[PDB]
Amino acid sequence: AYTNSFTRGVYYPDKVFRSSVLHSTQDLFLPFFSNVTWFHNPVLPFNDGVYFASIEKSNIIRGWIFGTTLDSKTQSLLIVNNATNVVIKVCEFQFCNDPFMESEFRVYSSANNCTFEYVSKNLREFVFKNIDGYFKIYSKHTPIDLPQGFSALEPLVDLPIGINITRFQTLLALHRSAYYVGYLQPRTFLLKYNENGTITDAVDCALDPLSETKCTLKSFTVEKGIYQTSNFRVQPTESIVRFPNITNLCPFDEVFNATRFASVYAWNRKRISNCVADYSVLYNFAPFFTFKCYGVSPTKLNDLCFTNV
Amino acid sequence: SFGGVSVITPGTNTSNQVAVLYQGVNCTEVPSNVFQTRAGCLIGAEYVNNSYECDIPIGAGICASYQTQSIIAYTMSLGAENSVAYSNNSIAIPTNFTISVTTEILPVSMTKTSVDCTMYICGDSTECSNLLLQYGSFCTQLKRALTGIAVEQDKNTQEVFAQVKQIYKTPPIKYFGGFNFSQILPDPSKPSKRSPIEDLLFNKVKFNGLTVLPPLLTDEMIAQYTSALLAGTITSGWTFGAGPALQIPFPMQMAYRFNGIGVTQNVLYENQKLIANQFNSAIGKIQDSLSALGKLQDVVNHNAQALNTLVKQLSSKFGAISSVLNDILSRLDPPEAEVQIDRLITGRLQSLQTYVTQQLIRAAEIRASANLAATKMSECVLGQSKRVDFCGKGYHLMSFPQSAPHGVVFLHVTYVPAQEKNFT
Amino acid sequence: DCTMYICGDSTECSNLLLQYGSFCTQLKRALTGIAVEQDKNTQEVFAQVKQIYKTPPIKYFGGFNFSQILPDPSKPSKRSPIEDLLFNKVKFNGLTVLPPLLTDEMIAQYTSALLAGTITSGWTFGAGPALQIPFPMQMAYRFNGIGVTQNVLYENQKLIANQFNSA
Amino acid sequence: KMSECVLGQSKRVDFCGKGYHLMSFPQSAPHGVVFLHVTYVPAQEKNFTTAPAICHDGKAHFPREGVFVSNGTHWFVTQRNFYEPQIITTDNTFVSGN
Amino acid sequence: ILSRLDPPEAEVQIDRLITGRLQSLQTYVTQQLIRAAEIRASANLAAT
Amino acid sequence: NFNGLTGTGVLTESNKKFLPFQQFGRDIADTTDAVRDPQTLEILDITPC
Numbered sequence A: 001a002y003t004n005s006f007t008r009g010v011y012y013p014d015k016v017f018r019s020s021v022l023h024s025t026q027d028l029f030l031p032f033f034s035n036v037t038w039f040h041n042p043v044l045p046f047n048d049g050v051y052f053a054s055i056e057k058s059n060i061i062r063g064w065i066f067g068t069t070l071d072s073k074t075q076s077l078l079i080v081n082n083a084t085n086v087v088i089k090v091c092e093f094q095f096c097n098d099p100f101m102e103s104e105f106r107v108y109s110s111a112n113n114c115t116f117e118y119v120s121k122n123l124r125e126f127v128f129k130n131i132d133g134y135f136k137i138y139s140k141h142t143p144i145d146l147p148q149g150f151s152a153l154e155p156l157v158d159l160p161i162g163i164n165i166t167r168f169q170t171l172l173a174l175h176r177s178a179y180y181v182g183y184l185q186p187r188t189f190l191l192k193y194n195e196n197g198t199i200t201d202a203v204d205c206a207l208d209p210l211s212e213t214k215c216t217l218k219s220f221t222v223e224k225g226i227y228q229t230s231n232f233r234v235q236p237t238e239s240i241v242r243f244p245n246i247t248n249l250c251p252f253d254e255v256f257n258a259t260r261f262a263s264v265y266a267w268n269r270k271r272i273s274n275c276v277a278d279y280s281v282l283y284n285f286a287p288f289f290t291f292k293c294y295g296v297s298p299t300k301l302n303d304l305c306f307t308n309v
Numbered sequence B: 001s002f003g004g005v006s007v008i009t010p011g012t013n014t015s016n017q018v019a020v021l022y023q024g025v026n027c028t029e030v031p032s033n034v035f036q037t038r039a040g041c042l043i044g045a046e047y048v049n050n051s052y053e054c055d056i057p058i059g060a061g062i063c064a065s066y067q068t069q070s071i072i073a074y075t076m077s078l079g080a081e082n083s084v085a086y087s088n089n090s091i092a093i094p095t096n097f098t099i100s101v102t103t104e105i106l107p108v109s110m111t112k113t114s115v116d117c118t119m120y121i122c123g124d125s126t127e128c129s130n131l132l133l134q135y136g137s138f139c140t141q142l143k144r145a146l147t148g149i150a151v152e153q154d155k156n157t158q159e160v161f162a163q164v165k166q167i168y169k170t171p172p173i174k175y176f177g178g179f180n181f182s183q184i185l186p187d188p189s190k191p192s193k194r195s196p197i198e199d200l201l202f203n204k205v206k207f208n209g210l211t212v213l214p215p216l217l218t219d220e221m222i223a224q225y226t227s228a229l230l231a232g233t234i235t236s237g238w239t240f241g242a243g244p245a246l247q248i249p250f251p252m253q254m255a256y257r258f259n260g261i262g263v264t265q266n267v268l269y270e271n272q273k274l275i276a277n278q279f280n281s282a283i284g285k286i287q288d289s290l291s292a293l294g295k296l297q298d299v300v301n302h303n304a305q306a307l308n309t310l311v312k313q314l315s316s317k318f319g320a321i322s323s324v325l326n327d328i329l330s331r332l333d334p335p336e337a338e339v340q341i342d343r344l345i346t347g348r349l350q351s352l353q354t355y356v357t358q359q360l361i362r363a364a365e366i367r368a369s370a371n372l373a374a375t376k377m378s379e380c381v382l383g384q385s386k387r388v389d390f391c392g393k394g395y396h397l398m399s400f401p402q403s404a405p406h407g408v409v410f411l412h413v414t415y416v417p418a419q420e421k422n423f424t
Numbered sequence C: 001d002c003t004m005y006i007c008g009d010s011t012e013c014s015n016l017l018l019q020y021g022s023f024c025t026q027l028k029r030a031l032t033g034i035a036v037e038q039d040k041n042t043q044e045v046f047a048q049v050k051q052i053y054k055t056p057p058i059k060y061f062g063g064f065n066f067s068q069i070l071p072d073p074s075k076p077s078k079r080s081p082i083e084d085l086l087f088n089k090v091k092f093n094g095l096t097v098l099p100p101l102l103t104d105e106m107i108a109q110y111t112s113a114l115l116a117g118t119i120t121s122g123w124t125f126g127a128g129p130a131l132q133i134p135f136p137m138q139m140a141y142r143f144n145g146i147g148v149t150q151n152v153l154y155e156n157q158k159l160i161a162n163q164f165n166s167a
Numbered sequence D: 001k002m003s004e005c006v007l008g009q010s011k012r013v014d015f016c017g018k019g020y021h022l023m024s025f026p027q028s029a030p031h032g033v034v035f036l037h038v039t040y041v042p043a044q045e046k047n048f049t050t051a052p053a054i055c056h057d058g059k060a061h062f063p064r065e066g067v068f069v070s071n072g073t074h075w076f077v078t079q080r081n082f083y084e085p086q087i088i089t090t091d092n093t094f095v096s097g098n
Numbered sequence E: 001i002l003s004r005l006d007p008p009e010a011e012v013q014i015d016r017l018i019t020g021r022l023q024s025l026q027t028y029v030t031q032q033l034i035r036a037a038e039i040r041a042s043a044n045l046a047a048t
Numbered sequence F: 001n002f003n004g005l006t007g008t009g010v011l012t013e014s015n016k017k018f019l020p021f022q023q024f025g026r027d028i029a030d031t032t033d034a035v036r037d038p039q040t041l042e043i044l045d046i047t048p049c
């Protein structure tokens, strides 16, 4: 299934307090009214950040797995949260292909070379991104298909890990005795701050022509008139490189076909001039035992120009 | 193909519908309602065959309006048609008249600003301050250019209001042949001393060197000039502007003023009650129209936007590695820091010089307006003019000044004929 | 279009250009401010009427022949013979020209309304309702306004009309 | 101003000096012009009692030009710009209304 | 400039073109503001 | 200097309320006008001389 977001995935772009100031910011957000996949599991791509919402009073989501290979022989991130608190950890793991008395934690079976440790209905939103080796998490837990409203998310962690991520999975608590996945794109918003310094509203500056007018004017109320907001630029397609033909193919055809060659001690010497050239007959000749080219590569013998051959 | 893109909106307080004009783009190369105009392709509005008054101007005779729950395009109408029943022995002569009162608003002065060049460019930095010595006398030019136009701003307000030698007062018995002037005369029970109408006019409207200087004349001082002009024209007519103020009763002043436009004086004296009733209602309508002033708000907004832009140019690199002078020099190499700081100085100096050039160009516009306002003060308030349309629409009788925050508002009283009949 | 002039659609230059701040916003505001006043300047010179006045089908007037300044339906855009003579004597990278709001036809409508108003009602329509008066009598009032008596017009009506028509 | 103050007489207030414009004479100055403005200024006013019209034979009489003044015991017609009284006659006035 | 220079060397040459072309375009617009005041003054005389 | 924030001005008790992750505030036009003391966790305004 797929659903329609409304105004979700807006987080505080940075520190810096602020008052009544319609501030304009450019960053990685979840676009407003976007197409978010729905899951009720398989390895998903990363590509640039992730939006992750969910709904449920109990706690079905039992951590995430991130990284490039999601396997051993290389380090990865693992985030779990038991009934105590969140545990960030970065080791080399060996993950079960299906990870999940009251005994638990059958997720991995190896934790080598740990480079980071840490210990300590309802809507639980997260924003994940990974920039310059920093893995950021924003979150907020607000009590009540998702509803409709606006709520800005605050920083949770600051993790100087260094980890690369291209794919991730999720972890669920099974029965033995619902979540969303969006992605972030570079967009521009106009953010409205209240006197307490919180974000109360936003405008997506890449949606309906009216929003582009609001963003250019730095307002949420536009007065009647006509406004120049942007520009139209037709784009070119295809790249055609035209050129001459040949004519004086400058006949290699005899120096490689001379019926009477010359003994080595008195070797012949033919100098090409400003004529046509086409080495495609040499490289593609088909019959050859040794062909080694030292100055330039054998294929770039046409993308160059020399004086005396 | 390239071109601008404009957004046509009825206002967010009316609807959220919108139409888009692609300027000089053919309607086959854009990627419902598509309308081709000589100004480009209009999409999202329907074109009708009727003709309305222009609301939102599109161009080349085409306008848009929000009338026919949607958005439409149309060729604006210039006005209603009227054929005049001309013949060679027919005349139309009025049998009645109305008194009309209209307003006119003019900016007189603007905000006096100065910028300290050293705090803008360097900002408490000794390495930069010494480098300013290698550019010569640029700051000398900057201070004189802004000061030379700041002095004129006080001159502009003296020439409009200080056109009377004495401070005239009205008698306590505020009652003039039946005319009620209490909305234009000072009301002894208000902030400072404004008329009830001036209260609408005033109620409706240290960073890093960027300093704002106060005007020489305060708003209380301008109110006192305008109340003296009002007292003179009601008690003394137009005599105080050519010598000593000479008293004459007001009913007799109005009779002279009718004579000056071609109306005999008996027409006033036998209808005195009607003209006083019409005047008193016409003045009372002014407060409804005020409760307009865009000619004054534009001056404040244009200068505020220039001051904000000047500050924002302090975050440009202008081809340096950092915008902060305490950064470059600290982490780099002095020989290189000097060249990069000189790039910041040059870029910021060019911004500041652009600011000054635009203030001189804008100062000429305010002076041109203030010269017109001074001319109207003498020719509309201190006398009766025959210049067509110069002192309001209709046959000029009289004018009363009102003060505004950075300008002056004239109340023009004109005579307009009505109810014509046919004669041979 | 600031970017198209300075860089000309090149991503390396246009990204470096961003380092100079907002000069390209100032350029647009300056040009917009003077491009809007061009229609305001024209609007305030010609739109001095509320009604569009038309002349009568007959055209005796009094001897005067204003046919050289009044519209001619047989000419392009219904201009006068003199307005036609006047219009008979007098693309790239990021540069465009905006059309005026008032077309030439609309300007001809303003001038024909002023011309139809004054020939039939004199100056009365600029102070109120248009009041007709015979043209010959309008000229006699105009002489009075300069200190000449009225009989000088009425006894020389053909002479004044002949001098006007020839001039 | 050269056209309107020197080549003619203006009624524009304060355009050709202070007072009632009579005439002006130009003088040449380096890079400029100097105007010598000749004006009419009234002086030495007296106060009088006035009335808009006079009744005679049950009819209202209005002045053709001027104002009615009273010196305390008798009424006269004067011109408005210079005190010069004349007797009120039927050639000085016109009749309109009752 | 983008074909016979490495990126650290081409940036310097692009800034020279931006500065020159920006200066010329900014001069163009200033001169139009100065002429625009004159046509407006003429239009006010024509309206009068 | 507040752990990197370099400036000049008069420090006074503020009446703003930061969020429990924010160090300093800026005004409109993006200039720092308040900071939080790292040790005492109090917000101070930074008016100019």
Ligand SMILES: *[C@@H]1O[C@H](CO)[C@@H](O[C@@H]2O[C@H](CO)[C@@H](O)[C@H](O)[C@H]2NC(C)=O)[C@H](O)[C@H]1NC(C)=O
Pocket (backbone or CB within 6 Å): A252, A253, A256, A257, A281, A282, A285
């Ligand atoms: C030397 O000459 C021979 C024959 O004259 C060339 O052989 C030709 O090779 C091309 C490519 O395979 C064939 O399509 C032709 O049919 C061949 N010629 C004949 C007559 O069959 C050979 O290419 C020449 N040497 C070089 C270096 O070009």
Ligand SMILES: *[C@@H]1O[C@H](CO)[C@@H](O[C@@H]2O[C@H](CO)[C@@H](O)[C@H](O)[C@H]2NC(C)=O)[C@H](O)[C@H]1NC(C)=O
Pocket (backbone or CB within 6 Å): B087, B088, B089
């Ligand atoms: C004023 O115009 C009217 C027409 O509108 C003139 O009446 C015409 O007079 C001529 C003779 O001069 C007759 O031949 C026509 O038959 C009349 N027309 C009508 C409809 O009766 C009138 O003569 C004009 N006045 C002057 C002084 O020229």
Ligand SMILES: *[C@@H]1O[C@H](CO)[C@@H](O[C@@H]2O[C@H](CO)[C@@H](O)[C@H](O)[C@H]2NC(C)=O)[C@H](O)[C@H]1NC(C)=O
Pocket (backbone or CB within 6 Å): B096, B097, B098, B274, B277, B278
């Ligand atoms: C001239 O016109 C005015 C209206 O503009 C007439 O005055 C109005 O007359 C009506 C009818 O008697 C009254 O109900 C209104 O109250 C009057 N208005 C005012 C402001 O007094 C006036 O009667 C007309 N004069 C003539 C001679 O017809």
Ligand SMILES: *[C@@H]1O[C@H](CO)[C@@H](O[C@@H]2O[C@H](CO)[C@@H](O)[C@H](O)[C@H]2NC(C)=O)[C@H](O)[C@H]1NC(C)=O
Pocket (backbone or CB within 6 Å): B175, B180, B181, B182, B183
């Ligand atoms: C002149 O008009 C003013 C209003 O602009 C009149 O003042 C009003 O008078 C009535 C009757 O006393 C009161 O109910 C209002 O409250 C008054 N308004 C204000 C603002 O005080 C005034 O009476 C008029 N003067 C004459 C002589 O008629």
Ligand SMILES: *[C@@H]1O[C@H](CO)[C@@H](O[C@@H]2O[C@H](CO)[C@@H](O)[C@H](O)[C@H]2NC(C)=O)[C@H](O)[C@H]1NC(C)=O
Pocket (backbone or CB within 6 Å): B085, B092, B420, B421, B422
């Ligand atoms: C004076 O008389 C003329 C006719 O000579 C009147 O003209 C009328 O104008 C209206 C439009 O306003 C037309 O619909 C009528 O057909 C005209 N009538 C005639 C008989 O042609 C004109 O209205 C009169 N003026 C006044 C002030 O009453």
Ligand SMILES: *[C@@H]1O[C@H](CO)[C@@H](O[C@@H]2O[C@H](CO)[C@@H](O)[C@H](O)[C@H]2NC(C)=O)[C@H](O)[C@H]1NC(C)=O
Pocket (backbone or CB within 6 Å): C059, C065, C067, C165
């Ligand atoms: C108005 O006057 C003009 C002349 O100034 C008349 O037009 C010309 O008339 C002569 C004959 O007298 C012709 O030979 C010309 O060809 C005419 N010119 C044009 C352009 O047509 C005109 O006929 C007069 N109008 C009326 C109604 O009498």
Ligand SMILES: *[C@@H]1O[C@H](CO)[C@@H](O[C@@H]2O[C@H](CO)[C@@H](O)[C@H](O)[C@H]2NC(C)=O)[C@H](O)[C@H]1NC(C)=O
Pocket (backbone or CB within 6 Å): D045, D046, D047
């Ligand atoms: C005309 O009479 C008025 C009084 O009705 C004179 O004004 C008075 O002038 C004296 C002397 O300057 C003052 O002391 C009084 O206060 C004035 N009275 C008022 C009510 O203002 C005026 O001076 C007389 N004009 C002439 C030429 O004598």
Ligand SMILES: *[C@@H]1O[C@H](CO)[C@@H](O[C@@H]2O[C@H](CO)[C@@H](O)[C@H](O)[C@H]2NC(C)=O)[C@H](O)[C@H]1NC(C)=O
Pocket (backbone or CB within 6 Å): D071, D072, D073, D074
């Ligand atoms: C007002 O002026 C008149 C006229 O000068 C004075 O009245 C007298 O009028 C008779 C003729 O009816 C003359 O013979 C007298 O010489 C006049 N007397 C004077 C003193 O001029 C009248 O006195 C004047 N009134 C006042 C109050 O001065």
Ligand SMILES: *[C@@H]1O[C@H](CO)[C@@H](O[C@@H]2O[C@H](CO)[C@@H](O)[C@H](O)[C@H]2NC(C)=O)[C@H](O)[C@H]1NC(C)=O
Pocket (backbone or CB within 6 Å): F038, F039, F040, F041
């Ligand atoms: C940093 O350390 C200081 C002590 O050096 C802490 O100051 C304490 O603050 C609490 C209130 O928050 C007071 O009740 C204590 O009495 C203070 N201690 C002293 C010795 O003055 C300060 O809270 C610490 N900051 C943080 C963020 O933990």
Ligand SMILES: *[C@@H]1O[C@H](CO)[C@@H](O)[C@H](O)[C@H]1NC(C)=O
Pocket (backbone or CB within 6 Å): A002, A003, A004, A035
């Ligand atoms: C999201 O896009 C997919 C195609 O990538 C489409 O099948 C799906 O219907 C879309 N979802 C919505 C809510 O439009």
Ligand SMILES: *[C@@H]1O[C@H](CO)[C@@H](O)[C@H](O)[C@H]1NC(C)=O
Pocket (backbone or CB within 6 Å): A080, A082, A084, A087, A119
């Ligand atoms: C919670 O999980 C962490 C990580 O596995 C572990 O170190 C910690 O002991 C757990 N707490 C309890 C009470 O089991």
Ligand SMILES: *[C@@H]1O[C@H](CO)[C@@H](O)[C@H](O)[C@H]1NC(C)=O
Pocket (backbone or CB within 6 Å): A112, A113
């Ligand atoms: C990581 O662990 C492997 C053994 O699994 C070891 O050989 C290697 O030295 C470790 N790397 C570091 C940086 O400790």
Ligand SMILES: *[C@@H]1O[C@H](CO)[C@@H](O)[C@H](O)[C@H]1NC(C)=O
Pocket (backbone or CB within 6 Å): A133, A162, A163, A164
């Ligand atoms: C992440 O992968 C990119 C290649 O996609 C590589 O160039 C980069 O060095 C990696 N980052 C880290 C921190 O290993």
Ligand SMILES: *[C@@H]1O[C@H](CO)[C@@H](O)[C@H](O)[C@H]1NC(C)=O
Pocket (backbone or CB within 6 Å): A194, A195, A196, F017
């Ligand atoms: C938060 O803002 C509300 C208004 O939205 C205000 O009433 C309240 O006092 C603020 N809270 C604080 C702690 O300043």
Ligand SMILES: *[C@@H]1O[C@H](CO)[C@@H](O)[C@H](O)[C@H]1NC(C)=O
Pocket (backbone or CB within 6 Å): B013, B014
């Ligand atoms: C603007 O909105 C207000 C309510 O906020 C309303 O009273 C007013 O009529 C609206 N104006 C228009 C033109 O719709």
Ligand SMILES: *[C@@H]1O[C@H](CO)[C@@H](O)[C@H](O)[C@H]1NC(C)=O
Pocket (backbone or CB within 6 Å): B026, B027, B028, B036
């Ligand atoms: C757009 O192009 C078509 C041909 O493809 C042409 O017929 C039409 O006139 C063009 N429109 C304009 C406004 O030039």
